[PDB]
Amino acid sequence: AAKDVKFGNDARVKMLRGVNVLADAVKVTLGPKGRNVVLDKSFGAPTITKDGVSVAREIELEDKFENMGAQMVKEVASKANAAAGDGTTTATVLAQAIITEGLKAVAAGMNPMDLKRGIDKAVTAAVEELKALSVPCSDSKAIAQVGTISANSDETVGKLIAEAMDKVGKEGVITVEDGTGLQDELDVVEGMQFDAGYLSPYFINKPETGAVELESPFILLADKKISNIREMLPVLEAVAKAGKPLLIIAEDVEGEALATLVVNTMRGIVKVAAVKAPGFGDRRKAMLQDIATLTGGTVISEEIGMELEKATLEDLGQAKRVVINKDTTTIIDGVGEEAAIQGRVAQIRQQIEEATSDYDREKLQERVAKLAGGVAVIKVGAATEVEMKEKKARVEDALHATRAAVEEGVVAGGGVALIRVASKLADLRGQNEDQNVGIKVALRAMEAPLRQIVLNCGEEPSVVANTVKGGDGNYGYNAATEEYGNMIDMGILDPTKVTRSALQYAASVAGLMITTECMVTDLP
Amino acid sequence: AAKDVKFGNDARVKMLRGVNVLADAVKVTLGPKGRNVVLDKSFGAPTITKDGVSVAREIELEDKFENMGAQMVKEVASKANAAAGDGTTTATVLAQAIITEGLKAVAAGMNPMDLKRGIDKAVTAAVEELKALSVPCSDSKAIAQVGTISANSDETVGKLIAEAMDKVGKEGVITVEDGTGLQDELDVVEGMQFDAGYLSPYFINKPETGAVELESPFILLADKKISNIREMLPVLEAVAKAGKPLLIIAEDVEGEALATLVVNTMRGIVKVAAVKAPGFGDRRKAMLQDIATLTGGTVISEEIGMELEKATLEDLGQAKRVVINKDTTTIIDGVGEEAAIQGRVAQIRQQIEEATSDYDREKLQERVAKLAGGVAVIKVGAATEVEMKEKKARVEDALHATRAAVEEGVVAGGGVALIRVASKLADLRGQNEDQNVGIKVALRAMEAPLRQIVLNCGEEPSVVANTVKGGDGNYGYNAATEEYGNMIDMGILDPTKVTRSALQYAASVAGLMITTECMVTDLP
Amino acid sequence: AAKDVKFGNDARVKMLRGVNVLADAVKVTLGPKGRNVVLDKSFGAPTITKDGVSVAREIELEDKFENMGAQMVKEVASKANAAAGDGTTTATVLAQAIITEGLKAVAAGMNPMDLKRGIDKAVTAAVEELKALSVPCSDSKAIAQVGTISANSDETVGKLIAEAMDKVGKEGVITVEDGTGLQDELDVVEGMQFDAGYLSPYFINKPETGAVELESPFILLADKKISNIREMLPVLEAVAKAGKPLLIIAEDVEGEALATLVVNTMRGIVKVAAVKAPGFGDRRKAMLQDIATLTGGTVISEEIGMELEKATLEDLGQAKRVVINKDTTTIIDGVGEEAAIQGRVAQIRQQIEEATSDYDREKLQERVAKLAGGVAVIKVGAATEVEMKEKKARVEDALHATRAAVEEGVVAGGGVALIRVASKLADLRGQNEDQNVGIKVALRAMEAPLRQIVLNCGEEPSVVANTVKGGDGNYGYNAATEEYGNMIDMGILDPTKVTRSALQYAASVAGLMITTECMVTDLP
Ligand SMILES: Nc1ncnc2c1ncn2[C@@H]1O[C@H](COP(=O)(O)OP(=O)(O)O)[C@@H](O)[C@H]1O
Ligand SMILES: Nc1ncnc2c1ncn2[C@@H]1O[C@H](COP(=O)(O)OP(=O)(O)O)[C@@H](O)[C@H]1O
Ligand SMILES: Nc1ncnc2c1ncn2[C@@H]1O[C@H](COP(=O)(O)OP(=O)(O)O)[C@@H](O)[C@H]1O
Ligand SMILES: [Ca+2]
Ligand SMILES: [Ca+2]
Ligand SMILES: [Ca+2]
Ligand SMILES: [Ca+2]
Ligand SMILES: [Ca+2]
Ligand SMILES: [Ca+2]
Ligand SMILES: [K+]
Ligand SMILES: [K+]
Ligand SMILES: [K+]
Ligand SMILES: [K+]
Ligand SMILES: [Mg+2]
Ligand SMILES: [Mg+2]
Ligand SMILES: [Mg+2]
């Protein structure tokens, strides 16, 4: 198909207009004072949201060149949200700031390559300052605080997350589900999560998360082999009755067992799943007995001399719910006895003094973390057909952001951290003047999040920004209460990874656009 | 698809314009002097109505931004009606008043967040003031009055509902169906209601009430779960041959069974509905047997050796009528014999004294209460197929509204309550002047219903509003007689829950619109 | 879909214009001097009619609001005609008169609800005056006069109906049907009429009259529900042979049997019609046997052990002609032997003295009437085929009006009755000036029919109307001869029911329109 082709300022004005439409719609939702955006649906009542992620998702423009501008910033803000677990709106706001001032610099006749070079220096320096400024979120109050803020200032979800981490630990397994109720609840059960992918993708019963979930299934294991389904027939029958879906994990299902198994999944008479299996050769024998011990099942191998034919209905392990993702598979609430599981822990704990290398004490300790750790499950319990599918996606991210806080720490929220970092970078310089202007472009942008938050309050960004800059450390503006004070004490905490990611992705796309001389698309 | 995006004033103006079209069309039907609105049908003759609910449902605008505004206020008003039983027109009048003045204030440049806080504060206080002003509906007279008003001053309706509730008791089952002749019929038959909904919303043949209406349906009671349609084949074919619909009650309906029971229900089934049997264990079995004895059906259990394919036409129960809501299933006039039914009730009572648990006594009680209770049936009299369906519409409405009156009590109608509450709030204040303006916005709006009623009479809203304000307590304007008096003595009563719910929902959407900076929709 | 929404004056002029197109097309055909209206057909020569009912049927307008106006008045005039058996044109004329003057009053700023109140009051008064003015229609001479006027001064039609009533009585059953050449026949035969409709409208072999007609059909009488066609199969094979169409009278026909027969009559090569037996309980089984005695057939019941599959050719009764409308079924000339029938009658007569309730005595009385009453068959002869059908249609029309004349009596035609009642209401007043204007609106409108009749003559409506007003009693204008005189002596008679209904229905829709503030319809 013949193409529409634009060059230079022509290309860039259209990108900028498209960026402007995207960012102007998204930025109004930033901070506790965010305005509402009405989003139309094909039929029925419109959706009304303060959520920048939902707003960005709907933006697409008629003009193709403008549209490319918007999709560029979207993709990049979307990557920040997936890496850090939050920051989409912040990343979008920053991107518009850098792009706008950057293109003014290009239009004045300044070297774009130098402009981009100075922006990058500023960002690399800004990222180090953030790492310096950061402080640990080690503590229940703080974790709850950060959770609450990633939760859109919802205490309950912040309380839940900090509650989960208390029981299962900071790096412990935590999963998000629906459940039945108008309110959200938390449960801590026996289960584990190891990295195994689906053997075939078509197992997936839920395309949204691209994962498989079976309800009250059975678990199978190897060992051997599995070359042929002929020995998979007898155990498939008994599982057919009782209406309980079957799960087969290990090990290395191949041939028609790998193939003819995936056929019956597409047809509605069967529900089955398979996984990439344990970390073997030798260690799989350890991992499997761990799974079997958790699921209350038995491990039947040909090595020992046992056959898959003799395997009975009770020979299988069991769990309440199972989830198999692309790279991962999780077991929720195994039915294995606690006396069994507990003794299996001690058996592995002896091997710690029995370990002749640092490499073994890692693995075996990773196993005791799976069995002894358990799995904390939170049920969103937002009651609606539409409200459920959504709130599960935000809490899933709110959990990701808290994890990010626990890893790389936290900094003063409300755009204060970026304001502070920019003040420290006041002396930073480039190789030439154009690189210098680039640097100042980045440093000006770092004020945009605070300014926008304030503007959404109906107060004057100039005055508040000035007042905050005139202060020190974690002093900031609390946009909920309209008062200044210590941001950390006030509990307004950004995960450092989130602030960091927002700026980096923002600056990425902005460098790209500032360095863009040509666009190609389809004819109108 | 590419989107049309508007911001700020340009957006709010279009939204307000769509609200005006909706409200101006709905509000002229308010009260006993309501004007007619003519609504077209693609075929046949136009519908002429004073019912705000019917007018609202038809409104959709060509301009997509205007339409979003209309749909926003519609949803909120129907949420109110769904919660309180009545008040759609009132809610819309209130929404228009709050939005209009609120938007005027925003255009003047006041802080929209503060405006919303002000409105919210006035409503919260108004709601309490309303609860205090409220009075219980104790007896048949006041109950009749409430029904009569919700019936558009039809005293025969109020009389019916008062008598229906007298027979079944104020806590108990009352349904309504088309009558065979000019006269009204009130009879109490054998029936029952438990809590289960439809498994899929597509089962709804009546979009207005969102309910599944099935006339002379066969009832399948299954003690198992159905994931597969192939075993439902011989049973269904028998049903499609008899020219009757089918209600499926089992453990669950899923897999291809559901999906097939959905699409096939659209054309060639030609009608079927299925609900999840309430409870579990021996309770779920015992409840199914209750339903079987009522409809003269036989429960299918796998443990007795019975199968679905061996199920004949006489293993299916039968009832005159069955209705299914999202949370509810109602079986009216089972064919089951007395002796089987009476033999059953004497059996559960015998289970009371044998029962060793106080919990079991209350649980077995709920079962005898349903079998011995039966269901009250109201058949709407005459006079023609279109007139009937309108009267059946009113009786249902009045039924809902009378409920609400029972729970939360009543207040003076004619918009007098909101007028009184407003005058009590004269001294209310906010944190700043903008919140004050918001409070005055809400208080001004609380005069909208009375004024509109008066305006529909062809009188002058200012003069009447003034006179009522100068009066005291339940003193008001009777718009039917155009005479002032005591609203309670004149039998003009609104359920407090209705007035409350209307103000709240209206204020909810208004606050949303006052705080909206951006709208996204499809291209024209 | 998006809607077009109009308000107030903008909405009302469009309704008015639509009413004007409908009314101006219909009203030119009023009375003996009515002008021709030409109605197109997709092929061949146009239809030329002086019949208002035919003109009104064809009117539909492009502008969707104008169309709404017209359909509203059509529905109402149509309702009048169905109730009283004539008056469509009169009602349409009255409706236009009230609407036109009423809207003039609205535009002047008068209270629309008061205007309606005033119109309503004058109408109920006029209805009482019509009842007072009404005179009995008893003698064959007055009856034939009534029939003649309904027939457009066809004195042959009036004579036929009068003759028919001289035999079966004034409440007797009368059917008209295609006769032999040129010569009318009237003969009373064994037969009856009960209320049952066609179960499938597709059964109709006469799309115009809207009724199914079976010639010398067999008649099946079954006391059970026919579901499976297989039970019905052998009884059909006997009907397939002998080439005698079948009439199935059963408790009901549904499912496989319904859809099976309904389609087979469409494809041709088969003739069948199904109707449900009237009443329920024991009264249903009695009336079935009634039809069985009349047709000389046998009732097939489940109780005595009679099987529908064992029903032989002699089990079925026979009629000469059978005519099934949507409302009623008529069996003409049953084959049942006189001794049979009259024995069944004396059996009922006995039970009439045995009745312990006056409900039975009325019901049993109804039956003997149908059995011993017989049916009058009017056979219309004509010079040509096309000349026969229209004369037949003239008789069917006049039959309706004649019955109405018999029930409620007669008044002076030519719109003199309405003129007289109006002059008598001159002092009538309402609660205020606006109500007074409404009354005058109605009173002025009552002159519209005479004026229009005179206008179709080509004379001056003011002069004739003024002269009639100047006289008393039944003095009026004869439009046929263009002379004044006594309307009753000249045989110009309106059934009081017709005049009353036309006025009532016209005032109904007129008040509705005078009170409409909003119209909602589809976009063009
Ligand atoms: N009480 C508060 N005062 C000031 N800033 C706040 C407050 N609560 C949250 N914020 C800020 O709002 C920002 C998050 O806004 P949000 O609308 O979630 O955009 P994003 O999608 O980028 O997270 C963070 O920078 C956070 O510090
Ligand atoms: N005789 C009356 N005098 C004054 N107000 C009345 C009278 N009858 C009903 N109303 C008022 O009409 C309102 C309900 O009117 P309606 O048109 O049904 O609107 P909605 O759909 O909001 O209930 C109530 O506020 C009630 O008090
Ligand atoms: N010879 C006559 N002189 C005056 N009026 C007549 C005469 N014959 C019939 N009419 C009147 O014509 C009217 C019937 O009009 P028609 O054309 O049948 O329309 P509609 O459907 O209203 O009956 C009646 O009011 C009747 O009295
Ligand atoms: Ca749309
Ligand atoms: Ca610059
Ligand atoms: Ca139409
Ligand atoms: Ca104001
Ligand atoms: Ca603003
Ligand atoms: Ca002349
Ligand atoms: K937000
Ligand atoms: K109303
Ligand atoms: K302020
Ligand atoms: K005519
Ligand atoms: Mg966030
Ligand atoms: Mg109401
Ligand atoms: Mg006529």
Side-chain angles (χ1 to χ4, degrees), chain B residues 208-512:
Chain B
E208 295 84 359
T209 41
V212 184
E213 312 283 18
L214 295 177
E215 218 67 33
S216 298
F218 281 109
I219 309 172
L220 171 59
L221 308 167
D223 215 347
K224 86 189 214 182
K225 344 78 192 304
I226 302 155
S227 56
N228 214 95
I229 187 198
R230 176 85 64 81
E231 71 254 22
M232 287 293 302
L233 259 291
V235 174
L236 289 175
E237 281 181 315
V239 184
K241 169 184 169 302
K244 301 288 187 58
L246 176 66
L247 179 68
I248 311 176
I249 314 178
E251 289 197 28
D252 205 351
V253 178
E254 53 188 353
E256 73 177 16
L258 182 47
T260 267
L261 275 183
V262 171
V263 146
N264 286 346
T265 20
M266 304 291 303
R267 283 130 293 185
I269 197 171
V270 294
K271 279 92 61 180
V272 144
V275 310
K276 184 188 297 181
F280 65 101
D282 285 326
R283 300 199 172 296
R284 183 184 54 182
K285 327 303 179 56
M287 294 182 187
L288 295 188
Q289 185 65 297
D290 286 342
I291 301 173
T293 294
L294 204 179
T295 65
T298 294
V299 176
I300 155 190
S301 309
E302 286 191 349
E303 303 79 319
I304 334 170
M306 186 58 172
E307 300 174 346
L308 276 181
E309 297 78 306
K310 297 181 179 298
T312 64
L313 193 72
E314 176 57 320
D315 289 331
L316 300 202
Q318 205 167 2
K320 292 191 183 305
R321 187 164 153 97
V322 58
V323 184
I324 299 81
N325 273 10
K326 55 181 189 70
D327 26 87
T328 267
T329 298
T330 303
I331 305 177
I332 312 162
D333 215 329
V335 185
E337 294 289 33
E338 286 295 333
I341 296 177
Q342 294 299 115
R344 186 71 175 185
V345 302
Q347 282 185 353
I348 304 184
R349 292 188 166 103
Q350 191 181 36
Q351 295 184 3
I352 272 142
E353 326 306 343
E354 299 171 330
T356 81
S357 176
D358 186 89
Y359 172 84
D360 300 337
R361 292 178 183 246
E362 183 65 24
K363 184 59 175 40
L364 285 178
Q365 252 303 323
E366 304 174 6
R367 292 207 295 154
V368 306
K370 293 176 174 52
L371 282 181
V375 169
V377 166
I378 301 172
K379 308 175 183 175
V380 179
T384 303
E385 201 66 354
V386 154
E387 293 184 8
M388 163 86 59
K389 280 310 185 183
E390 187 274 345
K391 191 179 175 194
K392 174 187 188 292
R394 280 186 299 148
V395 179
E396 285 164 9
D397 302 341
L399 186 46
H400 296 69
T402 304
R403 287 301 183 193
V406 163
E407 302 172 4
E408 302 192 19
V410 293
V411 293
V416 163
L418 290 178
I419 283 276
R420 294 287 175 239
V421 164
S423 68
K424 290 183 181 295
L425 302 180
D427 288 22
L428 193 67
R429 295 294 187 270
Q431 293 177 279
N432 55 48
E433 185 54 35
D434 285 344
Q435 295 184 22
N436 290 338
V437 167
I439 298 177
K440 295 313 182 189
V441 156
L443 300 192
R444 271 192 265 113
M446 286 171 219
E447 303 179 23
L450 190 151
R451 291 174 174 269
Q452 184 65 38
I453 294 169
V454 169
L455 195 62
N456 297 336
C457 295
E459 308 296 307
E460 306 184 83
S462 280
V463 186
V464 174
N466 236 38
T467 298
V468 172
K469 282 194 192 182
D472 192 34
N474 293 321
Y475 181 73
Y477 182 86
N478 180 328
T481 64
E482 288 197 347
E483 296 282 11
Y484 295 95
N486 184 297
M487 302 307 287
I488 311 307
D489 294 336
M490 295 183 288
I492 306 170
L493 302 192
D494 296 342
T496 313
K497 187 166 176 173
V498 170
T499 306
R500 179 173 69 78
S501 290
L503 179 57
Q504 292 181 167
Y505 277 115
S508 172
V509 66
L512 294 181

Side-chain angles (χ1 to χ4, degrees), chain B residues 23 26-31 50-53 56 73 76-78 80-81 84 86-98 130 149 412-418 445-453 456 494-507 509:
Chain B
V26 169
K27 74 180 178 182
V28 299
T29 69
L30 184 69
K50 301 182 179 174
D51 178 33
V53 168
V73 174
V76 127
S78 54
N81 191 284
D86 198 13
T88 291
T89 314
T90 307
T92 308
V93 164
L94 287 166
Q96 179 185 47
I98 299 180
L130 236 35
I149 296 272
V416 163
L418 290 178
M446 286 171 219
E447 303 179 23
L450 190 151
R451 291 174 174 269
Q452 184 65 38
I453 294 169
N456 297 336
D494 296 342
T496 313
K497 187 166 176 173
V498 170
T499 306
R500 179 173 69 78
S501 290
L503 179 57
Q504 292 181 167
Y505 277 115
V509 66

Side-chain angles (χ1 to χ4, degrees), chain A residues 94-261:
Chain A
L94 290 161
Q96 174 184 55
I98 307 182
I99 289 177
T100 295
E101 298 296 321
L103 297 173
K104 291 185 202 179
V106 168
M110 288 191 246
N111 188 309
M113 301 300 303
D114 289 324
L115 279 176
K116 163 174 147 48
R117 219 169 148 90
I119 285 163
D120 289 350
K121 193 176 191 159
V123 179
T124 291
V127 172
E128 292 307 289
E129 299 300 322
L130 290 168
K131 285 178 181 169
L133 199 57
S134 187
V135 298
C137 207
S138 35
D139 137 78
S140 225
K141 189 194 69 185
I143 295 175
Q145 285 167 348
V146 130
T148 291
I149 293 220
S150 310
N152 200 21
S153 295
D154 187 322
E155 281 97 353
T156 299
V157 34
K159 197 190 176 77
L160 287 175
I161 298 173
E163 202 55 40
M165 292 187 179
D166 272 336
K167 321 195 169 309
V168 302
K170 298 177 177 180
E171 287 87 24
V173 185
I174 307 180
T175 224
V176 182
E177 287 181 1
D178 308 342
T180 60
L182 198 58
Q183 296 187 349
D184 5 21
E185 299 308 334
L186 166 64
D187 298 319
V188 177
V189 294
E190 269 287 18
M192 77 161 66
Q193 186 183 74
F194 54 96
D195 316 333
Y198 50 78
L199 285 178
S200 179
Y202 273 98
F203 292 150
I204 297 159
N205 322 116
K206 291 202 170 184
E208 74 282 1
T209 52
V212 167
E213 68 189 36
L214 322 184
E215 197 58 26
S216 314
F218 286 79
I219 289 69
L220 303 178
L221 53 67
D223 299 324
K224 291 184 108 96
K225 292 188 296 182
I226 303 78
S227 75
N228 184 20
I229 67 149
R230 210 168 181 90
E231 49 178 332
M232 306 323 310
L233 304 183
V235 292
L236 177 52
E237 290 181 329
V239 173
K241 186 178 66 63
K244 301 172 76 74
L246 170 60
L247 188 163
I248 328 115
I249 50 176
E251 163 268 343
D252 254 305
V253 334
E254 296 301 334
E256 171 267 336
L258 176 57
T260 293
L261 174 42

